[PDB]
């Protein structure tokens, strides 16, 4: 759910709508519903830019994309009502036909957005990018319909133009510029290690020092013959300065390609560090819960803090001993650090993680990284036991 950590972002949405409505209600009341939709559309594009301000305002990128989907639905509902109240299925003049085409493209794209199971991610993104064409068609419709009412020196013109320009710039940046100018960390793959039958560790030497905090992730672009160059999110699993570690589990065609065919010496690009699961900023007492590859952020901390400064109970749940990674590293860390408690749960034979019996520290922060299904029950049990325990969770998807 949403909390005060996102309130600023929420305020930015709410102030966006009221200021829009009060504007239209003052100039063209008959156009509150379309105009609001326009503002909403703009916000949708602004919510896709992955800018650090967005993460600061909405806490996490997952909440950013949740609000992005909400603005999309609000836009489409308002646009459908506007079409019903002010037209039919095809316009009589070019200005109305632009709106017809724009609304058809918007509806089709929103319908296809919930077709990700049947569509590869890159094809999904390429289909999704038609929102820019729909937005341009809608802007053309709006401006040829309104004429000089939106080209004068008044509040309505400034508001409409400002939101339209912000949406246009956000869409252009995310579609055409983000992968070309916003990936300034150029690196070379120097070492690869296969941890088990389906997980590979990648070591990257960068041209510049990379600043991150343990528990954060980054978008990686790989440049190799036979590899896709689309950015994929991976948690940083160690390294400092000009060295980075990423631990990739096989979960699809691209990650299987990484496990099988990735070569040392290939080019990689990284943009920046994302994430709200900063372990070093938590309480003194901490409980770590990792499911499978969700161990990747905590490992980073272990690799960057040889002497543990917190009281940590780590629960690592894996589906069989063949699916476990970094067991020797975790055992060495537990032996070296008396304040580190290690609980290895083989879910095939030991059952599952149950917190109805295990104790929790009083003033404790609980970090969760793993499947949402098994994290939800654990969070419910922990909240039932100690309702004031701080809880942070990070998932491995956006849609
Ligand atoms: C914040 C975050 C941190 C992550 N950290 C790790 C990590 O440390 N180790 C690890 O092994 N995996 C991690 N992942 C998951 C990793 O991003 C996916 O496994 C990978 O991108 C899927 O590639 P694929 O083509 O092999 O999978 P596919 O078979 O194409 O898809 C499988 C799943 O991955 C999603 N997916 C596919 N391509 C992308 C993409 N370009 N961007 C986003 N999602 C995509 C799909 O929506 C689907 O849910 C993380 C994901 C997120 C969001
Ligand atoms: C009017 C409606 C919408 C507009 C204008 C819009 C706009 C955009 C744009 C321009 C991008 C950038 C794509 C790129 O990287 O090239 C994007 C990404 C994204 N959109 Fe939308 N979108 C809309 C609706 C939706 C819906 C309905 C969903 C989910 C059901 C959604 C989820 C996402 C996600 C998850 C991403 C990021 C995917 C990734 O980069 O991995 N959006 N959106
Ligand atoms: C400030 C914003 C907007 C204003 C002032 C506005 C104004 C109008 C007007 C005056 C009409 C009547 C046209 C006619 O009767 O021929 C109309 C129709 C229409 N508009 Fe908009 N519009 C706005 C935004 C949008 C957007 C963003 C879209 C689509 C993305 C859209 C889609 C449509 C559609 C589909 C019609 C139906 C036309 C028809 O079939 O006759 N409108 N709008």
Residue numbers in the entry: 2 to 400
Reproduce, without paraphrasing, sentences from the article in which this PDB structure was first reported.
Evolutionarily distant proteins with the NOX catalytic core have been found in bacteria, including Streptococcus pneumoniae NOX (SpNOX), which is proposed as a model for studying NOXs because of its high activity and stability in detergent micelles. NOXs belong to the ferric reductase transmembrane component-like domain (FRD) superfamily and are composed of a catalytic core with two conserved domains: a domain with six transmembrane helices (TM domain) coordinating two hemes by four conserved histidine residues and a C-terminal cytosolic dehydrogenase domain (DH domain) containing the flavin adenine dinucleotide (FAD)-binding and NADPH-binding sites. The DH domain catalyzes a hydride transfer to FAD, which subsequently transfers electrons stepwise to the two transmembrane hemes. The structure of SpNOX corresponds to the canonical NOX structure, with an N-terminal TM domain that coordinates two hemes and a C-terminal DH domain bound to FAD.
